[PDB]
């Protein structure tokens, strides 16, 4: 196995992994593949000569695979899925195309809500975030094709699967979960906002996800995430 090294932005102390749903996405993909790899953080205020030589363009995250450097989070993920493949490594791509789009707009709705400083827009922006969460909830409670015409469900016509695409973590979860994590941490701290308990699909999904070390152990600590958003989030008076 060629060496696999993921380079990611360092956090506030210049050493630990910094806030980034992109870093975490790739960390999760690598963990779920079962490949041997490591992670090197990059203090972007003090780049080492080694990192400058590997990636003169300065993009982060980036992947060193053998002696070749790959940039662009989406492209890195596609490369990893293709090269770390069966029979040696598990295919992580979702079976259902909609799994790959469900809930992604949540991050944008969150970003508008958290960066807004106009008091007149707070309620509207919160509603927009809530609605996008509801659409994700609807996806998670809609039976997938695998579940066709089943009769074992507790509530008729309601999906009980663990994750976006079925009962296994897929690339789709690796994209969405790090984003949902940021949304939860930042909204609780700076907006007094939590995902309603009434969104039972979303909550079952998050419960299942936090119970998996591939997700839980790749989350930056609450403090780094909160610090990353402090300036934009405090603007609203
Ligand atoms: Ca509230």
Curated annotation (Swiss-Prot):
Result when mutating residue 55 to A: Loss of glutathione-dependent oxidoreductase activity
UniProt keyword Ion transport present: yes
Disulfide bonds: 20-55
Start and end residues of each stretch annotated as Required for insertion into the membrane: 1-86
Topology versus the membrane: Single-pass membrane protein
Influence of pH: Optimally active at neutral to slightly alkaline pH.
Xref: InterPro entries: CLIC, CLIC-1_C, CLIC_N, Glutathione-S-Trfase_C-like, Glutathione-S-Trfase_C_sf, Glutathione_S-Trfase, Thioredoxin-like_sf
Intervals of motif G-site: 20-23
Modified residues (N6-acetyllysine): 9, 115, 127
Keywords: Acetylation, Cell membrane, Chloride, Chloride channel, Cytoplasm, Disulfide bond, Endoplasmic reticulum, Glutathionylation, Ion channel, Ion transport, Membrane, Nucleus, Oxidoreductase, Phosphoprotein, Transmembrane, Transmembrane helix, Transport, Voltage-gated channel
General function of this protein: In the soluble state, catalyzes glutaredoxin-like thiol disulfide exchange reactions with reduced glutathione as electron donor. Reduces selenite and dehydroascorbate and may act as an antioxidant during oxidative stress response. Can insert into membranes and form voltage-dependent multi-ion conductive channels. Membrane insertion seems to be redox-regulated and may occur only under oxidizing conditions. Involved in regulation of the cell cycle.
Entry similarity comment: Belongs to the chloride channel CLIC family.
Note: The protein seems to have very low affinity for glutathione, even though glutathione binding was observed in protein crystals.
Protein name: Chloride intracellular channel protein 1
Organism field: Homo sapiens
Gene name, Swiss-Prot/TrEMBL: CLIC1
């Amino acid at each position: 196995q060629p060496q696999v090294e993921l380079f990611v932005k360092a956090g506030s102390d210049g050493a630990k992994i910094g806030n980034s749903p992109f870093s975490q996405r790739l960390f999760m993909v690598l963990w779920l593949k079962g490949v041997t790899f490591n992670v090197t953080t990059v203090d972007t205020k003090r780049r080492t000569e080694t990192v400058q030589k590997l990636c003169p363009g300065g993009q982060l995250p980036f992947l060193l695979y053998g002696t070749e450097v790959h940039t662009d989070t989406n492209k890195i993920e596609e490369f990893l899925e293709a090269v770390l493949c069966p029979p040696r490594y598990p295919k992580l791509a979702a079976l259902n195309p909609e799994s790959n789009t469900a809930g992604l707009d949540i991050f944008a709705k969150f970003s508008a809500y958290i960066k807004n400083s106009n008091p007149a827009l707070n309620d509207n922006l919160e509603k927009g975030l809530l609605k996008a969460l509801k659409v994700l909830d609807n996806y998670l409670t809609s039976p997938l094709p695998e579940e066709v015409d089943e009769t074992s469900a507790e509530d008729e016509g309601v999906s009980q699967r663990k994750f976006l695409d079925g009962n296994e973590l897929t690339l789709a979860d690796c994209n969405l979960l790090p984003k949902l994590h940021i949304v939860q941490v930042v909204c609780k701290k700076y907006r007094g906002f939590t995902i309603p308990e009434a969104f039972r699909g979303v909550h079952r999904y998050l419960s299942n996800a936090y119970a998996r070390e591939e997700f839980a152990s790749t989350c930056p600590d609450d403090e780094e995430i909160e610090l990353a958003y402090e300036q934009v989030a405090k603007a609203l008076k």
